Design a protein around this ligand. Structure first.
Ligand SMILES: [Zn+2]
Ligand SMILES: [Zn+2]
Ligand SMILES: [Zn+2]
Length: 159
């Protein structure tokens, strides 16, 4: 080779407990590397689907840490918190699922709306009955299925 190849950012060290889940997290880099490599090499057909597999991998990460910290109980809040702060799982996403009314949720920035200045939500969060009303209100038609943000087929819990 000739030059080294390592560039990561860390703040606090992880407790020995991290060794129990050290190789499983490394496997995600090989899967993310396939979609991450397509963005720089070979990028003509099938592109949005490649990124959906990357943001979708985040769900398996929270389920892996959630399955061992909330069910297996084989880890301590310090390691579980060190992972949430060093890019491992997502507390805001696991919190939205624990809340009430979040049965059809796919991501964190793909199902949120505001009522103060502007609205930043995704169409997949809105069911078809709500989307159909918009067409009748503007004298037009409508027909959504999946959103471009991730690989979701329209998720709506209200309807
Ligand atoms: Zn989504
Ligand atoms: Zn969406
Ligand atoms: Zn969705």
């Amino acid at each position: 080779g000739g030059s080294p190849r390592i560039k990561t950012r860390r703040s606090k060290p992880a407790p020995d407990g991290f060794e129990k889940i050290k190789p499983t997290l490394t496997d995600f880099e090989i899967q993310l590397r396939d979609a991450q490599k397509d963005k720089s090499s070979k990028l003509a057909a099938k592109s949005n689907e490649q990124l959906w597999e990357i943001m979708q991998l985040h769900h398996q990460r929270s389920r892996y840490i959630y399955t061992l910290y909330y069910k297996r109980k084989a880890i301590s809040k310090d390691l579980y918190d060190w992972l949430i702060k060093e890019k491992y799982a997502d507390k805001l996403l696991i919190a939205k699922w624990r809340k009430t009314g979040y049965e059809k949720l796919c991501c964190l920035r793909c199902i949120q709306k505001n009522e103060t200045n502007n609205g930043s939500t995704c169409i997949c969060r809105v069911p078809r009955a709500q989307l159909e009303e918009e067409a009748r209100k503007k004298g037009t038609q409508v027909s959504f299925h999946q959103c471009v943000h991730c690989g979701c087929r329209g998720c709506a819990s209200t309807d």
